[PDB]
Amino acid sequence: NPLTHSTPKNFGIGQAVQPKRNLSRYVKWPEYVRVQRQKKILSIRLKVPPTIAQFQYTLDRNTAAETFKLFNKYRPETAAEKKERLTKEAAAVAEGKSKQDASPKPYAVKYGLNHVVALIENKKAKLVLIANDVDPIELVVFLPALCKKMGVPYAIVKGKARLGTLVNQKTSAVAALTEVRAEDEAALAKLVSTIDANFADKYDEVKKHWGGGILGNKAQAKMDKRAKNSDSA
Amino acid sequence: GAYKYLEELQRKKQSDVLRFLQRVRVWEYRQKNVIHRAARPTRPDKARRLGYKAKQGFVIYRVRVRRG
Amino acid sequence: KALKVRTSATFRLPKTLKLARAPKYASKAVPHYNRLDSYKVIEQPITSETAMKKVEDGNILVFQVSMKANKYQIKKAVKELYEVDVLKVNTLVRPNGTKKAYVRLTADYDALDIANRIGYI
Amino acid sequence: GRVIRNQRKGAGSIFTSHTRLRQGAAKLRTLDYAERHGYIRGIVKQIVHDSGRGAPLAKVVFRDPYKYRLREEIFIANEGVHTGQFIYAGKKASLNVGNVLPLGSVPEGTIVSNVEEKPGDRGALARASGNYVIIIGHNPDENKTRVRLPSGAKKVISSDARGVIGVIAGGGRVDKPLLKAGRAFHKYRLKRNSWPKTRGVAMNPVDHPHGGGNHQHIGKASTISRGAVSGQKAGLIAARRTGLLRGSQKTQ
Amino acid sequence: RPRQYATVSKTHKTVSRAYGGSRCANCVKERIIRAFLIEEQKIVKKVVKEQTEAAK
RNA sequence: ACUGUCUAAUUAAAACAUAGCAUUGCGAUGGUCAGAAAGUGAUGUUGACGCAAUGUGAUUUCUGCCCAGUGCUCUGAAUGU
RNA sequence: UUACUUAUUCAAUGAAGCGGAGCUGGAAUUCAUUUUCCACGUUCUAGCAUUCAAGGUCCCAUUCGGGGCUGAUCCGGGUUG
Ligand SMILES: [Mg+2]
Ligand SMILES: [Mg+2]
Ligand SMILES: [Mg+2]
Ligand SMILES: [Mg+2]
Ligand SMILES: [Mg+2]
Ligand SMILES: [Mg+2]
Ligand SMILES: [Mg+2]
Ligand SMILES: [Mg+2]
Ligand SMILES: [Mg+2]
Ligand SMILES: [Mg+2]
Ligand SMILES: [Mg+2]
Ligand SMILES: [Mg+2]
Ligand SMILES: [Mg+2]
Ligand SMILES: [Mg+2]
Ligand SMILES: [Mg+2]
Ligand SMILES: [Mg+2]
Ligand SMILES: [Mg+2]
Ligand SMILES: [Mg+2]
Ligand SMILES: [Mg+2]
Ligand SMILES: [Mg+2]
Ligand SMILES: [Mg+2]
Ligand SMILES: [Mg+2]
Ligand SMILES: [Mg+2]
Ligand SMILES: [Mg+2]
Ligand SMILES: [Mg+2]
Numbered sequence: 001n002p003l004t005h006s007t008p009k010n011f012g013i014g015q016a017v018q019p020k021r022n023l024s025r026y027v028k029w030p031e032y033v034r035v036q037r038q039k040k041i042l043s044i045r046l047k048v049p050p051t052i053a054q055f056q057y058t059l060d061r062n063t064a065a066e067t068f069k070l071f072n073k074y075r076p077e078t079a080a081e082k083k084e085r086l087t088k089e090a091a092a093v094a095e096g097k098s099k100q101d102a103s104p105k106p107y108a109v110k111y112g113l114n115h116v117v118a119l120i121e122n123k124k125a126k127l128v129l130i131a132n133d134v135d136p137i138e139l140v141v142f143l144p145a146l147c148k149k150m151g152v153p154y155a156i157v158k159g160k161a162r163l164g165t166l167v168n169q170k171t172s173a174v175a176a177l178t179e180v181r182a183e184d185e186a187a188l189a190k191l192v193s194t195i196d197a198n199f200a201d202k203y204d205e206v207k208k209h210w211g212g213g214i215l216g217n218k219a220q221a222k223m224d225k226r227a228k229n230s231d232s233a
Numbered sequence: 234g235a236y237k238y239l240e241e242l243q244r245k246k247q248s249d250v251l252r253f254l255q256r257v258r259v260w261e262y263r264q265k266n267v268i269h270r271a272a273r274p275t276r277p278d279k280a281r282r283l284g285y286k287a288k289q290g291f292v293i294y295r296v297r298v299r300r301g
Numbered sequence: 302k303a304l305k306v307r308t309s310a311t312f313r314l315p316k317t318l319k320l321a322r323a324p325k326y327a328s329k330a331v332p333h334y335n336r337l338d339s340y341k342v343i344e345q346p347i348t349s350e351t352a353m354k355k356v357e358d359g360n361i362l363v364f365q366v367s368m369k370a371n372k373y374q375i376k377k378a379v380k381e382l383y384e385v386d387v388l389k390v391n392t393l394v395r396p397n398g399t400k401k402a403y404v405r406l407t408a409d410y411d412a413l414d415i416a417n418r419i420g421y422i
Numbered sequence: 423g424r425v426i427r428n429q430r431k432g433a434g435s436i437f438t439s440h441t442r443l444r445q446g447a448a449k450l451r452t453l454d455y456a457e458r459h460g461y462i463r464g465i466v467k468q469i470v471h472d473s474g475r476g477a478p479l480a481k482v483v484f485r486d487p488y489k490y491r492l493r494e495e496i497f498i499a500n501e502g503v504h505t506g507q508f509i510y511a512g513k514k515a516s517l518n519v520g521n522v523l524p525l526g527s528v529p530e531g532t533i534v535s536n537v538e539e540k541p542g543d544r545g546a547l548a549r550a551s552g553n554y555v556i557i558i559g560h561n562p563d564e565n566k567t568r569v570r571l572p573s574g575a576k577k578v579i580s581s582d583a584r585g586v587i588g589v590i591a592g593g594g595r596v597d598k599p600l601l602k603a604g605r606a607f608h609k610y611r612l613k614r615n616s617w618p619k620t621r622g623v624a625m626n627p628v629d630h631p632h633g634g635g636n637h638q639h640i641g642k643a644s645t646i647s648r649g650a651v652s653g654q655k656a657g658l659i660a661a662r663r664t665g666l667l668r669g670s671q672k673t674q
Numbered sequence: 675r676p677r678q679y680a681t682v683s684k685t686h687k688t689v690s691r692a693y694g695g696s697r698c699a700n701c702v703k704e705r706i707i708r709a710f711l712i713e714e715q716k717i718v719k720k721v722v723k724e725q726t727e728a729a730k
Numbered sequence: 731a732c733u734g735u736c737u738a739a740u741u742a743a744a745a746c747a748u749a750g751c752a753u754u755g756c757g758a759u760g761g762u763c764a765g766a767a768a769g770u771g772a773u774g775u776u777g778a779c780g781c782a783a784u785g786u787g788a789u790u791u792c793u794g795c796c797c798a799g800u801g802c803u804c805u806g807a808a809u810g811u
Numbered sequence: 812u813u814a815c816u817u818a819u820u821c822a823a824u825g826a827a828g829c830g831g832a833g834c835u836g837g838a839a840u841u842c843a844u845u846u847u848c849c850a851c852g853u854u855c856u857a858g859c860a861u862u863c864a865a866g867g868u869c870c871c872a873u874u875c876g877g878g879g880c881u882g883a884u885c886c887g888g889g890u891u892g
Contacts, residue, residue, distance in 0.1 A: 004865080004866075005865065005866075006865065006866045006867085007864070007865040007866070008864080008865065008866065008882070009860095009864065009865080009882085009883090010852055010853075011852080011883065012852035012853060013455070013456050013459065013460035013461075013462070013487075013852080013853060014456070014460065014461070014462055014463060014487075014852095014853035015852080015853055015860070016853095016860065017485075017486070017487065017488065017489060017490050017860070017861070018487055018488050018827080018828085019863080019864080019883070020308040020863060021308065021827080021828075021883080022306050022307070022308060023307060023308060023309060023310045023826090023827060023828085024304060024305065024306065024307050024888070025827095025828090025829085025887090025888050025889090025890080026310050026826060026827055026828080026829090026888090026890055026891095027307055027309070027310050027311070027312055027826075027890085028310060028311065028312060028824090028825095028826040028890070029312055029826090029890095030312060031264075035261065035264050035265070038264075038817090039257070039260075039261055041817075041889085042257055042260060042817055042818085043257055044817090045816070045817040046253065046256065046257065046817070048253055049249040049250045049252075049253050051249070051250045052250055052253060052254075113234075113235045114234035114235050114236070117234055117235050117238070118234060135275075136273070136274070136275050136276070136277060137254070138238075138239050138242055138243070138254075139235055139239065139277065141242075141250070142238045142242065146238075215815090215816085216816090216817095216887095216889055217830070217831075217887055217889080218829075218830050218831090218887090218889055219815085219816075219889090220830095220831095221830065221831055221887095223815085224831095225831090256818080259818095260817085260818065263818095299767090304888080308863085309825090310824090310825075310826055310827065310890080311825065311826085428762065428763065428782080428783070429762095429763065429764080430763085430764090431762080431763055431764085431772065431773075431782090432762080432763030432764035432765090432771080432772050432773085433763080433764050433765090433771085433772065434763090434764075434771070434772030434773080435772090437772065437773075438772065438773080438774095439772090439773070439774065439775075439776075441774095441775060444775045445775080446775055447774095447775040447776090448775080448776095449775095452823075452824070453823080453824095453891095453892095454824085454827080454828095455827065455828055456853095459828090460853075461853080461854085462853085463853075463854075465857060466857090467857085472775085474775095474776095475775095475776090476779060476780090477779085485860075487827090489861085490860075490861035491861085496775090505857075506856095506857035507857085508854075508856095508857090510854070515854090516854065518854095536777095539757080539758070540821090540822065540823095540892080541822095541892075542822065542823055542824095542891085542892070543758095543822065543823080544823090545777095546757080546758075546777065547757065547777065547778095548777075548778090549776080549777055549780085550776095550777065550778065550779055550780055551779050552779045553777085553778075553779065553780090571757060571777095571778080572757095572777090572778050572779085572780090573756085573757065573778050573780095574778095575757060575778095577757065582892095590779090592779085593779070594779080595779055596779045597779090599749070599750070600748095600749060600750085601749060601750090602732095602733080602748075602749055603733080603734065603747075603748040603749065604733085604734090604748090604749095605749080606748075606749070607748095614773075614781095616773095616781090616782090618735095618746090618747050618748070619747085619784095620746070620747080621746085621747095621784080621785070621786090622784075622785095623784090623785075624745080624746060624747095632784080632785095640784090642800075642801070643800065643801035643802065644753095644754090644784060644785075644801090644802090645754085645801060645802035645803080646754095646783090646784095646801090646802075647801085647802065648755095652762090652763070652764090655762075655763095655783075656783060656784065657754080657783070657784045657785085658753065658754040658755080658783075658784060658785090658802075659754065659755050659761090659762085659782095659783060659784090659802095660754080660755060660802075660803075661753080661754050661755080661802055661803070662754090662802075662803040662804070663753095663754090663802090663803075664753065664754075664802075664803095665752095665753070666752065666753075666793090667752090667753080704857085704858080705857095705858045705859085706858080707858085708856065708857085708858040708859095709858040709859060710858090711856075711858090712856070712858065712859085713858090713859085715855085715856090
């Protein structure tokens with residue numbers, strides 16, 4: 001009020017140098033950024049075959065979190081827990097004369113790609129988890145079809161790295177369960193039901209549907225409003 | 234194991250699933266430098282039977298050459 | 302939440318952390334001793350007749366001096382070896398490929414005296 | 423035989439442009455926010471002679487909308503523009519000699535110079551002293567504009583393509599005889615090394631298709647096909663007619 | 675010569691009026707009168723189109 | 731026509747050039763030209779009062795007839811190759 | 812044959828304001844209410860236009876300094892053709 005004044009500015013083309021604004025939409029990115037974005041786009045623009053694109057249909061965050069919840073009880077031995085187990089059965093077995101068992105039959109999530117494949121082939125898998133990222137996609141893509149044929153209930157899940165954490169690796173392509181402690185059997189059957197309902201049942205129909213063929217929005221609104229006026233005046 | 238499946242799939246080049254893959258990948262490569270380091274094999278079964286190993290000291294490079 | 306706010310359209314190489322070298326083993330294993338010392342800087346006196354004259358009439362000492370040495374290195378070395386104050390130092394390259402220093406002392410010192418103290422005449 | 427003269431020019435040794443004194447490329451302002459929505463004002467700070475050019479340049483300064491500073495442009499000067507004059511450039515801008523407007527925004531019969539081929543190229547057509555182009559019509563659906571270039575040709579370009587009102591200055595330059603070798607000499611001295619010209623018919627065979635013979639003469643038809651190959655094309659290339667042109671020129 | 679201007683005192687490089695070592699007096703005279711009259715007519719320009727909006 | 735230019739070391743000329751005159755190609759996704767190739771290059775800091783390609787040779791005067799041939803060219807033809 | 816754009820191609824720019832919607836106006840005539848289409852800070856003058864903007868507002872615990880929001884409407888990150 002007192003000696004203070006209201007100036008204000010005219011930003012109106014031909015006066016008053018423009019204020020600093022957010023140009024983030026316009027910044028010129030490094031090529032490696034430019035590509036990983038354009039790669040994402042090109043995959044959406046193209047028509048994508050049903051044997052791929054049966055991915056992108058991914059387990060919902062709820063059913064998944066319940067699935068991780070169960071799986072996380074089954075983690076493999078930590079480095080310490082094996083060193084620990086050994087000294088137990090290094091002593092007790094070699095002396096107390098139990099034959100190679102001072103240790104209980106372990107129950108753990110099964111992993112590694114070649115490991116899991118032969119498990120599915122051998123019908124030993126109760127549940128197979130498949131990641132959605134897996135850049136050389138071929139390592140994985142045959143798995144739903146393999147599972148479907150072997151009558152092994154499977155799910156496509158987000159987090160190749162989140163599958164990793166539960167096995168104590170940076171990443172894992174797959175995670176599977178074969179054995180389960182009798183205490184957890186019913187929770188599993190419940191998970192298997194919801195999962196089979198979202199994947200193994202829908203397999204045949206999904207197999208018929210191509211994906212992609214999706215426009216960007218500048219192209220979208222152009223044809224949304226062009227087909228809008230042309231037909232209905 | 235998985236490698237056997239990769240082998241057979243890769244023998245269908247004109248199959249719709251590989252035609253897609255071929256088309257997307259060939260664009261990406263052509264965007265990068267004519268010689269550029271590859272993080273991992275994109276044919277793990279092929280590398281494998283040519284003597285590749287996942288231990289430290291093995292390296293993959295990707296490269297472009299003109300045709301004709 | 303939402304994205305970063307950049308007000309500029311140029312993306313620049315992120316300013317990242319540069320670590321100083323911490324060698325696991327020494328470079329050359331012994332440091333080289335001083336490559337130009339006062340004894341290697343000033344080589345011989347120059348006793349030519351016309352040089353001896355600068356000593357008598359000019360209060361000036363003429364030395365053959367290392368080709369690798371500058372006016373600073375010459376001044377200091379004459380100062381340390383001969384216990385004398387230097388006024389100024391002029392130099393030139395002889396045409397046999399050697400360097401000649403014309404070294405004038407300060408008014409306090411007598412070049413002639415200092416010349417037959419070092420022992421030439 | 424030898425590589426003839428018109429083959430040696432492409433290697434650009436002694437044939438490159440003599441560029442040292444030139445004021446710098448003449449261009450329109452970059453096509454930006456101001457110019458495609460509003461207009462923007464400038465002052466011609468000077469109008470100046472460019473070396474090896476027929477027509478004067480005009481230095482025109484503007485304010486930088488995004489930063490505090492002045493930004494100076496080099497225009498080809500239209501006849502009648504003057505120092506101190508205000509120049510207006512943009513979609514919405516009054517129609518006056520010296521201003522730059524999109525071809526769509528001016529009525530037929532409008533006369534403009536330094537007109538862009540595509541929008542944004544900062545001008546292509548009608549830059550030589552005396553020249554202009556005329557707007558002969560509009561097609562508002564697909565927003566094109568039909569113009570007639572100095573050659574007589576009629577081309578159709580984007581109505582967004584910019585041009586500048588008026589004609590280029592220094593016209594009539596070619597009406598005055600050069601009168602002597604020296605005037606030509608100093609002329610090409612500031613252009614490139616094209617002068618003088620030896621006639622192929624005064625050369626030996628090694629040198630040129632026309633070379634040789636105990637009398638000077640071409641010896642075969644001097645009309646050469648497009649299909650001809652380098653070292654063959656000299657004389658009248660792809661001529662659809664030849665001989666003194668009788669009767670009115672001026673395409674219908 | 676340009677570098678000698680660094681060896682001389684500031685009074686040799688200026689005159690006491692605004693825009694002293696830069697513009698030519700009579701030029702400064704002009705940009706005063708011009709500034710003033712334009713800043714005035716700028717008021718005249720607003721209130722006239724302030725009424726034009728109100729009566730139309 | 732003039733002033734000008736060349737065969738250093740047998741030709742300085744009527745030869746070459748020149749202004750003037752005329753013809754030809756091209757609106758840039760181009761004309762002419764360079765390169766083994768290229769995200770290459772000359773014209774081009776260019777735009778037809780321009781660049782590129784030929785001829786004739788200042789002024790005055792005048793440049794007739796012939797498109798069958800060889801070229802060049804074409805909003806042409808079509809049931810032959 | 813003619814549409815599409817992501818391959819490929821061309822131009823531009825220290826990848827700055829693109830596309831879609833909304834505010835206020837208004838031409839417009841209402842056949843129930845808006846069915847729409849344009850707009851939507853700069854043109855007597857060879858001045859001046861920069862310190863994340865003054866203003867307004869909310870904070871830090873009132874220091875001197877300093878921050879947030881608004882001023883400058885939302886939404887999609889397709890740099891513009
Ligand atoms: Mg590695
Ligand atoms: Mg010296
Ligand atoms: Mg050059
Ligand atoms: Mg020459
Ligand atoms: Mg000639
Ligand atoms: Mg000639
Ligand atoms: Mg001859
Ligand atoms: Mg020949
Ligand atoms: Mg021939
Ligand atoms: Mg001949
Ligand atoms: Mg002849
Ligand atoms: Mg003074
Ligand atoms: Mg002051
Ligand atoms: Mg003579
Ligand atoms: Mg001779
Ligand atoms: Mg002579
Ligand atoms: Mg002679
Ligand atoms: Mg004549
Ligand atoms: Mg290339
Ligand atoms: Mg002659
Ligand atoms: Mg001529
Ligand atoms: Mg007659
Ligand atoms: Mg007759
Ligand atoms: Mg004939
Ligand atoms: Mg841009």
